Amino acid sequence: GSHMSNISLIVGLGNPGSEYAQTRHNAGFWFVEQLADKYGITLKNDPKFHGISGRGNIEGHDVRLLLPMTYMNRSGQSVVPFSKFYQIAPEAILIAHDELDMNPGVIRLKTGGGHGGHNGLRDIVPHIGPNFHRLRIGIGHPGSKERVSGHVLGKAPSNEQSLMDGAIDHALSKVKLLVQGQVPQAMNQINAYKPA
Numbered sequence: 001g002s003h004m005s006n007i008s009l010i011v012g013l014g015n016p017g018s019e020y021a022q023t024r025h026n027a028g029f030w031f032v033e034q035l036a037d038k039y040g041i042t043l044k045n046d047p048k049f050h051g052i053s054g055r056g057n058i059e060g061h062d063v064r065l066l067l068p069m070t071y072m073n074r075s076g077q078s079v080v081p082f083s084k085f086y087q088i089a090p091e092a093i094l095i096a097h098d099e100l101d102m103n104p105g106v107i108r109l110k111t112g113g114g115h116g117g118h119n120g121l122r123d124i125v126p127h128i129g130p131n132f133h134r135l136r137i138g139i140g141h142p143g144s145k146e147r148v149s150g151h152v153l154g155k156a157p158s159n160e161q162s163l164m165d166g167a168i169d170h171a172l173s174k175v176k177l178l179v180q181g182q183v184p185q186a187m188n189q190i191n192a193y194k195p196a
């Protein structure tokens, strides 16, 4: 199983299919796919856990990566059984997700808290509790609430995409701290990111 607060499972939230791959609600997929390429972790089909998943070495630590293929609001149907099967406690999980309550180009590491309205996190917290870590990738808010599906399922304009891409890149550089259990330092260094 996992061991303490060394991060050993990194989940990226999103929806499957080409039609959703560039949408804001796939920000977590972007981060995990980029992380997998950085470290040479193969993301392969994982039908048992309704996802795409991988396993490999990050900086001397055995780490698993998971992209649920459930659709966002059923993400727990992948995350929960996967984490349970591999005996990964919440404290060793990082979930990367889009965050409506933060600007494009803002990124933060958070431990605990609720779903903040995010329909993927909403499907996970009831089962494993809140005590996992989150990489909150700011995407902005559309203003109004009847309109959240339109914003998160949109493809950001180029300036906003560039801001998110820079924040994600910064966070990739801090995964070494996370897999080493240096959550406080990683939090400080991630949360200090500015785009310019």
Ligand SMILES: [Cl-]
Residues within 6 Å of the ligand: 015, 025, 072, 073, 119
């Ligand atoms: Cl959705």
Ligand SMILES: [Cl-]
Residues within 6 Å of the ligand: 108, 109, 110, 136
């Ligand atoms: Cl935060």
Ligand SMILES: [Cl-]
Residues within 6 Å of the ligand: 110, 113, 114, 115, 116, 134, 136
């Ligand atoms: Cl969160």
